[PDB]
Amino acid sequence: KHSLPDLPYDYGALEPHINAQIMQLHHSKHHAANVNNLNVTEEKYQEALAKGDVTAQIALQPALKFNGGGHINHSIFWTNLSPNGGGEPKGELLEAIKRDFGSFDKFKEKLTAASVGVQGSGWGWLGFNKERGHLQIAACPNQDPLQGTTGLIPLLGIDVWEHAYYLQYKNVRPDYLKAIWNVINWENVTERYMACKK
Amino acid sequence: KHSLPDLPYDYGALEPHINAQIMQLHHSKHHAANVNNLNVTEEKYQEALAKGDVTAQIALQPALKFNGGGHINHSIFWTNLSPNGGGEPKGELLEAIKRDFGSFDKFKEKLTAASVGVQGSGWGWLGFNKERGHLQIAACPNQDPLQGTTGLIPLLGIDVWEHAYYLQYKNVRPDYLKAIWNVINWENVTERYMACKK
Amino acid sequence: KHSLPDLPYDYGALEPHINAQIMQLHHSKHHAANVNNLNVTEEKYQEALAKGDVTAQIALQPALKFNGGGHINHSIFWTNLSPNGGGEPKGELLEAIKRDFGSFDKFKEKLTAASVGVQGSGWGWLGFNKERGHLQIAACPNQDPLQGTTGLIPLLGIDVWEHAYYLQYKNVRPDYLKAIWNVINWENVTERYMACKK
Amino acid sequence: KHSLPDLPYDYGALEPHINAQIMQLHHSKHHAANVNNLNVTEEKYQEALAKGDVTAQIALQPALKFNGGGHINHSIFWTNLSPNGGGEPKGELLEAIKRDFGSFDKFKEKLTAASVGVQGSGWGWLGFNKERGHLQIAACPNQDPLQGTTGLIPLLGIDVWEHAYYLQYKNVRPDYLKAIWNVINWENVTERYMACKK
Ligand SMILES: [Mn+2]
Ligand SMILES: [Mn+2]
Ligand SMILES: [Mn+2]
Ligand SMILES: [Mn+2]
């Protein structure tokens, strides 16, 4: 059964880029609800699967994807942020960003654009395409998780649900995006990247 | 283990409205493939469940919905047809059709139009809305099954995938729809309805 | 050229059910953005259509549906609210609700459930089904408008995008739904209903 | 005014790989219906635009995408096939295929997989990603066209609607895909590729 992970930092640690109330609500209410609903749905799915009830299995798919994807996504998201984050990555990850997007700044432009571009709720991602052996940017709607729906391995996610920024930035999602670069934990993104090449 | 159901009649029994070559391919290849693939997918989902691998669970959803849906939908379809079919229903179902659609012929027009209106692959349905306590027509894409995706109880389904008609009617789906009324098993449709008036 | 309609009341007219900060942001920022983007998208569509550029037309569809949809839906929503609203509708609209949903209370529970049920961004609707001549509840994702995507005529819509409630109710969307019943403009819903007896 | 392009060859020129009955129906019935529905839908769209009728614009989108996409996709497809085709491309296009997919044979495996993988109606594509400056494989549902929905420039498309193969290969879509390699017009695919780097 799934459990809600502790953040790697206190709720106010990402101030002033992401305020404390957002972090507290986002973690203790939104991600919490994902975990609790996922446990409930998984238990129902097992019963349906055991009885061979295919209609029930299919009726449970939206809740499984939404809550299961929210747990996957939020869990990665917390680790992708740090009070000591910002700047640029180094080494092989920086080399690949240059290779695949031209420059770190071009890369930032493209993830920002993919994130700003989500109409409704969703996520922007930097992922790794294992088949092509290179980085790839992708957007996902609602809580659809990157690897389970696209096969890309997630490296850095940007939540652009309104609850991720509205209390502080209101409708101005581009101000949130500008601010979040200040808290990206490139050490974590680097670790995820290197794990794709072993 | 799911199994391919036996048909209630021979492959040639619906001639000349649905030819024998279509019935044999439809049942022994298309539905058979949905059953075989569904069994594999359910096995993989049990393993994913046992591991708490939510990514694997979500990645299996399209195959489960497609092949599970195709098993649900084709199994109902076979029972909805008969060499001894055709004509109009009677009793309570007929009275329900007049109550909700005006007349049997108006109903036929509306289910025809929903079936003709599917762009790409899919199904037209006459269903029962338990909340509203009345009949309802709906169309579904690909193999998305009626009850698992809409909550409606399926009473009569019309497969409008090209494999359901193309060998005989080619591009002219309305000719197929006109023909299929001659083989509807209204006795089955009535049993499904009464089991809704449970 | 589409324009932002004035609200029928001041920004704090719906206190304390929907606060003045939400009303001012919702109207002057969110709906304003829909209007501007719709005007720009329409002009680009016109250009594409004159050149017979089908690719360009299809690339513009997401922006047109989203911003066109947002303009349609927000414009209806302001007219569906009033400082002099709430309670139960008077006249034939209440008789139709009782007929189709059993009672006002059950109707409230069902539209609340459809609105709570939206996963991600979207709208709950009370619509009119002209073909069947009765009321119908439907949910729509993002800004997809009811009539253009389902054919139902909108009577009453509930915006359940997070910007519609988050600053005041945070994650507790059901508290928002409980509150909005106090400001429904049944005179407007009735006008819309009477215009469907057509 | 859009028009139905003549095929570049006779209906029987792709025998035995794609038979004459399929080519004749596919062009004279399927593509032909797309062209007239496109023209009619474009004229309705002009009227809706002139009136500022946003609901009408949104309600016409499914017909515009389906039939405009069908026109785009089928027009490319006829040019992608040749009685003098088959084999492998040469020059820059082959070098890009090796760079991006490993080898021509791995490319064929990957476009076959994408095309086999479509559940329901749709298309497999080799495209060009202009932002990344490299090749990319993608699948599209129904008649959704590649460039208009994904941004990728189409180079080679494989129709896997059942009407593209069923009369000849019945349910065995993999046997159609094996066969079609024998009639790919690599001269045309090369022309399309080189135009991407102008
Ligand atoms: Mn979130
Ligand atoms: Mn079928
Ligand atoms: Mn809104
Ligand atoms: Mn085709």
Swiss-Prot record, chains A, B, C, D:
UniProt keyword list: Acetylation, Manganese, Metal-binding, Mitochondrion, Nitration, Oxidoreductase, Transit peptide, Ubl conjugation
Signal peptide coordinates: none
Quaternary structure note: Homotetramer.
Modified positions (N6-succinyllysine) in chain numbering: 44, 51, 98, 106
Superkingdom per UniProt: Eukaryota
Gene, per the UniProt record: SOD2
Family to which the UniProt record says this protein belongs: Belongs to the iron/manganese superoxide dismutase family.
Protein name, as recorded: Superoxide dismutase [Mn], mitochondrial
Keyword presence, Mitochondrion: yes
